[PDB]
PDB file of C-alpha atoms and ligand atoms in Angstrom:
ATOM      1  CA  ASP A  19     216.743 136.116 148.800  1.00 55.61           C
ATOM      2  CA  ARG A  20     215.957 132.816 150.699  1.00 56.04           C
ATOM      3  CA  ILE A  21     213.046 130.909 149.259  1.00 51.97           C
ATOM      4  CA  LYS A  22     210.458 129.837 151.874  1.00 49.03           C
ATOM      5  CA  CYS A  23     208.423 126.625 152.343  1.00 49.27           C
ATOM      6  CA  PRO A  24     204.586 126.807 152.468  1.00 53.24           C
ATOM      7  CA  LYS A  25     204.930 126.785 156.248  1.00 50.11           C
ATOM      8  CA  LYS A  26     206.835 130.179 155.779  1.00 48.77           C
ATOM      9  CA  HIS A  27     210.309 128.845 156.987  1.00 50.73           C
ATOM     10  CA  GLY A  28     213.353 130.029 155.048  1.00 50.29           C
ATOM     11  CA  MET A  29     214.828 127.177 153.049  1.00 44.98           C
ATOM     12  CA  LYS A  30     218.558 126.676 152.401  1.00 45.16           C
ATOM     13  CA  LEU A  31     220.331 126.052 149.087  1.00 43.35           C
ATOM     14  CA  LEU A  32     222.353 122.868 149.489  1.00 38.98           C
ATOM     15  CA  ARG A  33     225.200 121.588 147.297  1.00 36.54           C
ATOM     16  CA  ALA A  34     225.115 117.991 148.926  1.00 34.78           C
ATOM     17  CA  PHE A  35     222.315 115.844 150.380  1.00 32.92           C
ATOM     18  CA  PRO A  36     221.760 116.622 154.057  1.00 31.75           C
ATOM     19  CA  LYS A  37     222.520 114.369 157.095  1.00 33.92           C
ATOM     20  CA  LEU A  38     219.774 112.915 159.506  1.00 36.03           C
ATOM     21  CA  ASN A  39     220.477 115.952 161.779  1.00 39.28           C
ATOM     22  CA  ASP A  40     219.400 118.579 159.132  1.00 37.63           C
ATOM     23  CA  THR A  41     215.691 117.367 158.900  1.00 38.46           C
ATOM     24  CA  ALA A  42     213.118 117.656 161.824  1.00 35.98           C
ATOM     25  CA  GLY A  43     211.994 113.989 161.441  1.00 40.02           C
ATOM     26  CA  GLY A  44     214.101 111.179 162.635  1.00 38.48           C
ATOM     27  CA  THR A  45     214.101 109.022 159.512  1.00 35.93           C
ATOM     28  CA  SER A  46     214.735 111.414 156.606  1.00 35.30           C
ATOM     29  CA  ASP A  47     217.525 109.681 154.754  1.00 36.60           C
ATOM     30  CA  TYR A  48     218.551 111.554 151.644  1.00 33.19           C
ATOM     31  CA  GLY A  49     221.021 108.869 150.666  1.00 33.21           C
ATOM     32  CA  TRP A  50     219.366 108.220 147.297  1.00 35.10           C
ATOM     33  CA  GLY A  51     218.126 111.704 146.779  1.00 36.41           C
ATOM     34  CA  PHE A  52     214.729 113.296 147.166  1.00 37.23           C
ATOM     35  CA  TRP A  53     211.549 114.275 145.381  1.00 35.46           C
ATOM     36  CA  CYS A  54     210.445 117.909 144.900  1.00 36.24           C
ATOM     37  CA  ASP A  55     207.500 118.681 147.038  1.00 36.37           C
ATOM     38  CA  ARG A  56     206.196 120.794 144.178  1.00 39.06           C
ATOM     39  CA  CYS A  57     206.961 119.359 140.719  1.00 41.86           C
ATOM     40  CA  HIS A  58     207.331 115.887 142.272  1.00 43.65           C
ATOM     41  CA  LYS A  59     210.552 115.413 140.241  1.00 44.73           C
ATOM     42  CA  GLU A  60     212.689 112.585 141.481  1.00 46.16           C
ATOM     43  CA  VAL A  61     216.205 114.090 141.758  1.00 46.22           C
ATOM     44  CA  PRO A  62     218.328 111.062 142.718  1.00 46.45           C
ATOM     45  CA  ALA A  63     221.902 112.584 142.610  1.00 44.78           C
ATOM     46  CA  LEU A  64     223.562 115.983 142.894  1.00 44.95           C
ATOM     47  CA  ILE A  65     225.953 116.586 140.060  1.00 43.14           C
ATOM     48  CA  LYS A  66     228.768 119.112 139.666  1.00 44.18           C
ATOM     49  CA  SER A  67     228.449 120.990 136.396  1.00 44.73           C
ATOM     50  CA  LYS A  68     231.735 122.067 134.769  1.00 42.51           C
ATOM     51  CA  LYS A  69     230.014 124.736 132.623  1.00 42.15           C
ATOM     52  CA  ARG A  70     230.847 127.490 135.154  1.00 44.79           C
ATOM     53  CA  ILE A  71     229.538 130.273 132.764  1.00 43.12           C
ATOM     54  CA  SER A  72     228.298 132.565 135.427  1.00 44.50           C
ATOM     55  CA  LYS A  73     230.183 135.898 135.420  1.00 45.60           C
ATOM     56  CA  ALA A  74     226.899 137.810 136.118  1.00 45.94           C
ATOM     57  CA  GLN A  75     224.311 135.017 135.637  1.00 45.10           C
ATOM     58  CA  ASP A  76     222.320 134.183 138.822  1.00 45.13           C
ATOM     59  CA  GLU A  77     223.505 130.659 139.474  1.00 46.31           C
ATOM     60  CA  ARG A  78     219.962 129.701 140.585  1.00 47.46           C
ATOM     61  CA  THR A  79     218.663 130.608 137.111  1.00 46.94           C
ATOM     62  CA  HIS A  80     221.252 129.125 134.897  1.00 48.62           C
ATOM     63  CA  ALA A  81     220.787 125.497 133.826  1.00 49.13           C
ATOM     64  CA  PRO A  82     217.892 124.726 136.028  1.00 48.82           C
ATOM     65  CA  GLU A  83     217.995 121.154 134.800  1.00 48.84           C
ATOM     66  CA  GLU A  84     221.473 120.935 135.971  1.00 46.31           C
ATOM     67  CA  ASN A  85     220.833 119.576 139.505  1.00 46.27           C
ATOM     68  CA  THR A  86     223.933 121.112 140.958  1.00 47.12           C
ATOM     69  CA  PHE A  87     222.016 121.921 144.164  1.00 47.28           C
ATOM     70  CA  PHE A  88     218.545 121.958 145.711  1.00 48.10           C
ATOM     71  CA  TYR A  89     216.550 123.709 148.412  1.00 50.04           C
ATOM     72  CA  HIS A  90     215.859 121.961 151.710  1.00 49.60           C
ATOM     73  CA  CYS A  91     213.823 123.038 154.685  1.00 49.20           C
ATOM     74  CA  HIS A  92     214.158 121.669 158.207  1.00 50.21           C
ATOM     75  CA  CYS A  93     210.459 120.728 158.095  1.00 46.74           C
ATOM     76  CA  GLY A  94     211.323 118.346 155.403  1.00 44.15           C
ATOM     77  CA  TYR A  95     209.882 120.318 152.462  1.00 44.99           C
ATOM     78  CA  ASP A  96     212.199 120.389 149.350  1.00 45.83           C
ATOM     79  CA  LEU A  97     212.409 122.071 146.045  1.00 46.47           C
ATOM     80  CA  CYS A  98     214.367 121.032 142.921  1.00 46.71           C
ATOM     81  CA  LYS A  99     216.459 123.702 141.249  1.00 51.23           C
ATOM     82  CA  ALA A 100     213.897 124.039 138.503  1.00 51.44           C
ATOM     83  CA  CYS A 101     211.207 125.043 140.953  1.00 49.47           C
ATOM     84  CA  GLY A 102     213.539 127.481 142.591  1.00 50.70           C
ATOM     85  CA  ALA A 103     214.457 129.000 139.291  1.00 50.80           C
ATOM     86  CA  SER A 104     210.842 129.741 138.431  1.00 49.12           C
ATOM     87  CA  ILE A 105     210.157 131.596 141.728  1.00 48.92           C
ATOM     88  CA  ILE A 106     213.303 133.753 141.268  1.00 49.81           C
ATOM     89  CA  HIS A 107     212.072 134.523 137.676  1.00 52.11           C
ATOM     90  CA  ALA A 108     208.534 135.335 138.840  1.00 52.96           C
ATOM     91  CA  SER A 109     209.777 137.501 141.844  1.00 49.93           C
ATOM     92  CA  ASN A 110     212.347 139.298 139.679  1.00 49.75           C
ATOM     93  CA  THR A 111     209.610 140.110 137.085  1.00 51.68           C
ATOM     94  CA  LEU A 112     207.507 141.599 139.987  1.00 52.65           C
ATOM     95  CA  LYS A 113     210.429 143.788 141.063  1.00 51.04           C
ATOM     96  CA  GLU A 114     210.897 144.893 137.465  1.00 50.11           C
ATOM     97  CA  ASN A 115     207.275 145.714 136.848  1.00 51.38           C
ATOM     98  CA  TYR A 116     207.476 147.596 140.248  1.00 52.52           C
ATOM     99  CA  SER A 117     210.570 149.721 139.490  1.00 54.56           C
ATOM    100  CA  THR A 118     209.148 150.336 136.010  1.00 54.73           C
ATOM    101  CA  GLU A 119     205.554 151.353 137.331  1.00 53.49           C
ATOM    102  CA  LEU A 120     207.421 153.546 139.893  1.00 55.36           C
ATOM    103  CA  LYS A 121     209.669 155.289 137.255  1.00 53.91           C
ATOM    104  CA  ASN A 122     206.435 155.847 135.201  1.00 53.54           C
ATOM    105  CA  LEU A 123     204.594 157.202 138.229  1.00 54.04           C
ATOM    106  CA  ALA A 124     207.421 159.634 138.902  1.00 54.33           C
ATOM    107  CA  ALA A 125     207.343 160.706 135.183  1.00 56.19           C
ATOM    108  CA  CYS A 126     203.434 161.104 135.029  1.00 56.00           C
ATOM    109  CA  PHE A 127     203.827 163.233 138.183  1.00 53.80           C
ATOM    110  CA  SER A 128     206.665 165.378 136.916  1.00 54.52           C
ATOM    111  CA  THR A 129     205.376 165.989 133.431  1.00 56.85           C
ATOM    112  CA  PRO A 130     202.381 168.304 132.751  1.00 61.06           C
TER     113      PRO A 130
HETATM  114 ZN1   ZN B 201     210.409 120.929 141.281  1.00 60.01          ZN
HETATM  115 ZN1   ZN B 202     209.464 124.297 156.154  1.00 63.89          ZN
END
């Protein structure tokens, strides 16, 4: 699922720094990389990792320090991979505690 910026727009996962045309403001130049609007990390270059060990590993969760991509919003709000990783983890945990609580609810209902 697409991560949203605080202004509720759906952000996009990018594998290369965007062009002037991708950000709302005129002057956003991502030539030397950007800063995460949340953990303030200065991510200066996008690197291609050769690990490739993702048969069934969410790419967004594996090797968060591996800045192989980032999330950008047109508004200009950005998230490093690491910050994206923690919201996928947190949201997956909510879905798990939901399906679990739902299976337990069905069981409590259909058990005397
Ligand atoms: Zn961050
Ligand atoms: Zn935005």
